Scaffold this motif. Structure first.
Motif, PDB file in Angstrom:
ATOM      1  N   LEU A   2       3.048-159.929  10.936  1.00 22.34           N
ATOM      2  CA  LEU A   2       4.372-160.440  11.276  1.00 22.34           C
ATOM      3  C   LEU A   2       4.316-161.899  11.712  1.00 22.34           C
ATOM      4  O   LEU A   2       5.250-162.662  11.443  1.00 22.34           O
ATOM      5  N   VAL A   3       3.228-162.310  12.369  1.00 21.89           N
ATOM      6  CA  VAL A   3       3.122-163.686  12.848  1.00 21.89           C
ATOM      7  C   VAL A   3       3.110-164.664  11.681  1.00 21.89           C
ATOM      8  O   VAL A   3       3.843-165.657  11.675  1.00 21.89           O
ATOM      9  N   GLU A   4       2.278-164.397  10.671  1.00 21.71           N
ATOM     10  CA  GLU A   4       2.251-165.270   9.500  1.00 21.71           C
ATOM     11  C   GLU A   4       3.534-165.158   8.686  1.00 21.71           C
ATOM     12  O   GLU A   4       3.979-166.144   8.087  1.00 21.71           O
ATOM     13  N   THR A   5       4.143-163.970   8.646  1.00 18.69           N
ATOM     14  CA  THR A   5       5.416-163.834   7.947  1.00 18.69           C
ATOM     15  C   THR A   5       6.480-164.722   8.583  1.00 18.69           C
ATOM     16  O   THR A   5       7.294-165.333   7.882  1.00 18.69           O
ATOM     17  N   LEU A   6       6.485-164.804   9.914  1.00 17.91           N
ATOM     18  CA  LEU A   6       7.411-165.700  10.599  1.00 17.91           C
ATOM     19  C   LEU A   6       7.024-167.162  10.405  1.00 17.91           C
ATOM     20  O   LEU A   6       7.893-168.016  10.204  1.00 17.91           O
ATOM     21  N   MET A   7       5.727-167.470  10.461  1.00 20.73           N
ATOM     22  CA  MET A   7       5.276-168.853  10.355  1.00 20.73           C
ATOM     23  C   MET A   7       5.403-169.411   8.946  1.00 20.73           C
ATOM     24  O   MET A   7       5.327-170.632   8.776  1.00 20.73           O
ATOM     25  N   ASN A   8       5.578-168.557   7.937  1.00 23.47           N
ATOM     26  CA  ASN A   8       5.804-169.052   6.586  1.00 23.47           C
ATOM     27  C   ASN A   8       7.131-169.786   6.457  1.00 23.47           C
ATOM     28  O   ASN A   8       7.289-170.594   5.538  1.00 23.47           O
ATOM     29  N   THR A  16       4.741-168.258  21.159  1.00 25.59           N
ATOM     30  CA  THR A  16       4.048-167.521  22.214  1.00 25.59           C
ATOM     31  C   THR A  16       3.831-166.049  21.878  1.00 25.59           C
ATOM     32  O   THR A  16       3.144-165.353  22.638  1.00 25.59           O
ATOM     33  N   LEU A  17       4.402-165.562  20.776  1.00 27.83           N
ATOM     34  CA  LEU A  17       4.073-164.228  20.290  1.00 27.83           C
ATOM     35  C   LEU A  17       2.573-164.091  20.065  1.00 27.83           C
ATOM     36  O   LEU A  17       1.977-163.048  20.368  1.00 27.83           O
ATOM     37  N   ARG A  18       1.946-165.148  19.542  1.00 29.36           N
ATOM     38  CA  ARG A  18       0.508-165.136  19.306  1.00 29.36           C
ATOM     39  C   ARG A  18      -0.258-164.929  20.605  1.00 29.36           C
ATOM     40  O   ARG A  18      -1.163-164.089  20.681  1.00 29.36           O
ATOM     41  N   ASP A  19       0.103-165.679  21.646  1.00 28.43           N
ATOM     42  CA  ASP A  19      -0.591-165.555  22.923  1.00 28.43           C
ATOM     43  C   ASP A  19      -0.356-164.190  23.556  1.00 28.43           C
ATOM     44  O   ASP A  19      -1.270-163.619  24.163  1.00 28.43           O
ATOM     45  N   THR A  20       0.861-163.656  23.437  1.00 26.55           N
ATOM     46  CA  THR A  20       1.133-162.332  23.987  1.00 26.55           C
ATOM     47  C   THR A  20       0.272-161.272  23.312  1.00 26.55           C
ATOM     48  O   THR A  20      -0.332-160.425  23.981  1.00 26.55           O
TER      49      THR A  20
END
Lengths: 56, 62
Positions: A2-8, A16-20
């Motif tokens: 999901l993180v890369e899907t959002l960052m695309n 901060t989702l990554r840090d969480t």
């Protein structure tokens, strides 16, 4: 993923989702945790002195 | 007719006057007889009769 899907869609300079996720999984750096362990007691000693005596 | 209700109703009045954040945390607990006067600690069985007389006393005045 999901993180890369959002960052695309983060190509544009918007806002901060990554840090969480990293802190929740158990992957944060833990070098020199003994210092933090003693800092905790140093900071909370007074309350212990308040609600108990022999332990103090 | 229950004990938990009596405990909460006796707890609310203490928070109606004054307490601190450290009182809420730590031990405290709703179980409460030492916070009362020493008269309840030393002789506990005898106190209930007097208390139950006084309560009925004040209700009629209200």
């Amino acid at each position: 993923d999901l993180v890369e899907t959002l960052m695309n869609k983060a190509g544009d300079d918007g806002k901060t989702l990554r840090d969480t996720l990293k802190i929740l999984t158990g992957r944060a750096r833990r070098d020199g945790a003994d210092d933090a362990a003693f800092a905790t007691v140093m900071r909370t000693m007074t309350d212990l002195a308040f609600f108990a005596k022999n332990a103090y | 007719s229950k004990q938990d209700v009596i405990d909460r109703l006796r707890s609310y009045s203490d928070l109606g006057r004054g307490a601190a954040t450290a009182l809420g945390t730590a031990k405290y607990y709703t179980g409460e007889l030492a916070v009362r006067s020493p008269f309840t600690k030393v002789l506990n069985g005898t106190t209930n009769y007097l208390l139950d007389a006084g309560r009925q006393g004040f209700l009629s005045d209200i």
